[PDB]
Amino acid sequence: GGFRLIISQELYQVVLDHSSVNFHIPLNELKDYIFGSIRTIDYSASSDKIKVVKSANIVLFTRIFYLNEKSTLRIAISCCVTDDVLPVLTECWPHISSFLDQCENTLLKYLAKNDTQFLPHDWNCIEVAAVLQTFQRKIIPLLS
């Protein structure tokens, strides 16, 4: 089914932006949905958010995490899908959350490899490709 995968981080920089052939919305509106709220408490911790972009019939789910204990900078793995996937997305969430964990581990290992705090924006980066592949082969198929 169609999807848009954005990997981004705070310094905001977009590392990957991939829409499926099958599949939008402005990048500045997304930065706000991803890193933008007075309804949720900000804990400075690793988390998951699901938001409905009413203006586009889309649901956005985001894993956001820190490089490490000492860091104040966030990395986000965000995905847009049709809002009618929300029932399946919520039914299958323990599966999706576990796959997002692997994606989070993968990007963190890149940072460890390169002793850096920054993902490339011109990614032969196998770690970024591995995340795209996890969405293509595991997450999105489960959401049909």
Numbering used by the authors: 9 to 19, 28 to 39, 44 to 56, 58 to 144, 148 to 168
Text lifted from the article:
Flcn is also known to have two paralogous binding partners, the Flcn interacting partners Fnip1 and Fnip2, which interact independently with Flcn. This Flcn/Fnip (either Flcn/Fnip1 or Flcn/Fnip2) complex has been recently reported to be involved in amino acid sensing through regulation of the Rag GTPases at the lysosomal membrane and therefore controlling signalling through mTORC1. With the motivation to understand more about the Flcn/Fnip complex, we sought to investigate their putative yeast orthologues Lst7 and Lst4. We solved the structure of the Lst4 longin domain, thereby confirming it as a bona fide member of the DENN family. Additionally, we show that Lst4 interacts with Lst7, not through its longin domain but through its DENN domain, and we demonstrate that the Lst7/Lst4 complex exists as a 1 : 1 heterodimer.
In order to overcome this, the Lst4 longin domain from Kluyveromyces lactis, a closely related budding yeast, was expressed, purified and crystallized. The K. lactis longin domain (aa 58–226) crystallized in the P42212 space group with four molecules in the asymmetric unit (AU). The final structure was determined at 2.14 Å resolution by molecular replacement of a higher resolution native dataset. Several loops were missing in the electron density, between β1–β2, β2–α1 and α1–β3, in addition to nine residues at the N-terminus and 13 residues at the C-terminus, most likely owing to their inherent flexibility. The structure reveals the classical architecture of a longin domain, which is the first domain of the complete DENN module. The domain is made up of a core five-strand β-sheet, with one short α-helix (α1) traversing the face of the concave side and the longer α2 and α3 packed against the convex side. An entirely novel feature, which is not present in any other previously determined longin domain structure, is the kinked helical extension to α2. ConSurf analysis of the structure identified two conserved surface regions of the Lst4 longin domain, which were mapped onto a surface representation of the Lst4 longin structure. The first patch (P1) mainly comprises residues from α1 and several that lie on the loop that precedes β3. The four molecules seen in the crystal structure do not represent a biologically relevant assembly, as an analytical ultracentrifugation experiment indicated that the protein was monomeric in solution.
